[PDB]
Amino acid sequence: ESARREVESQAQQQLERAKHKPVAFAVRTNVSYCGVLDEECPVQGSGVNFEAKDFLHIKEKYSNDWWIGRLVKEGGDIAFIPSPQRLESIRLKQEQKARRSGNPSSLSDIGNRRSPPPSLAKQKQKQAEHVPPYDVVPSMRPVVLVGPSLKGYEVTDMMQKALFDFLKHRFDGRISITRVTADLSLAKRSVLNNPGKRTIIERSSARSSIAEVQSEIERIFELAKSLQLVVLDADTINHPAQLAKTSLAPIIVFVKVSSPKVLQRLIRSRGKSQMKHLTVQMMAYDKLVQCPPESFDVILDENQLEDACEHLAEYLEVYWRATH
């Protein structure tokens, strides 16, 4: 047919003309689906074989069924990813190849109970959580440093100020440093339509701190849309799970001492002031190191300054070359 070849050529020239244009926004996925094996894509052979835990970048507009995207992989070419409704449709198609998907079991029961599919067999039900296949995340991954122990204390404070000064100095002109004095662990998306929309409601949630924390969320988004790498100097988060289910999806950097024996004397070296909070300062270390390392993105398990320095320099270097 001539129409399919014509739309193929049109998509090809649109991709060629859109190779050098700014990226619009990014998406987050939670299902391992391949966009190259689907025959409904406008262009065959130019799909994306992306697994879960992956980020995609959208630049231009195609239709309500497919979009033009790019991978965070280095050297990844321009491909097409399904739309969220297209992903819902393909998820529905995934469970229809099986013998049964609704209530009527096939345990030697054919022709007795036809059981036409009710509203229970469609995606209308199972709406208690209903996690969307796509999540909105900042275009550039934010970087968060976790205290080897409770933030706001001397030892940890110098531990992250060293990295902050290094990223500022070596990488000036392309990285912006922002400090979040307020909390950031109260980032929720499926609680209510608008809890405390106005400050004049005099509600319990209106006069609480959740409004400012909610306002903190999107400024990270606008800083990410500027292509400039941004870090988060949050003084409240001390565990990856505290900021893992939110829509930020940040890069978490682990600065840790190899042994608590070294940490105790390192705390001792500060003075008598830290002796009072030393007791509670051990648990912030041991609970955090008990966390599995797969949650953490990068690990700094060494004690020399320059080796860890170049380690993180090269990590953000590979992140830089990933999206350029």
Binding site: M158, A162, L305
Partner: peptide, 15 residues
């Protein structure tokens, strides 16, 4: 190693 780390980090506390 960690004392060197804290020394360099604390030295730049001046501003």
């Amino acid at each position: 190693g960690y004392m060197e780390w804290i020394s360099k980090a604390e030295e730049v506390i001046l501003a």
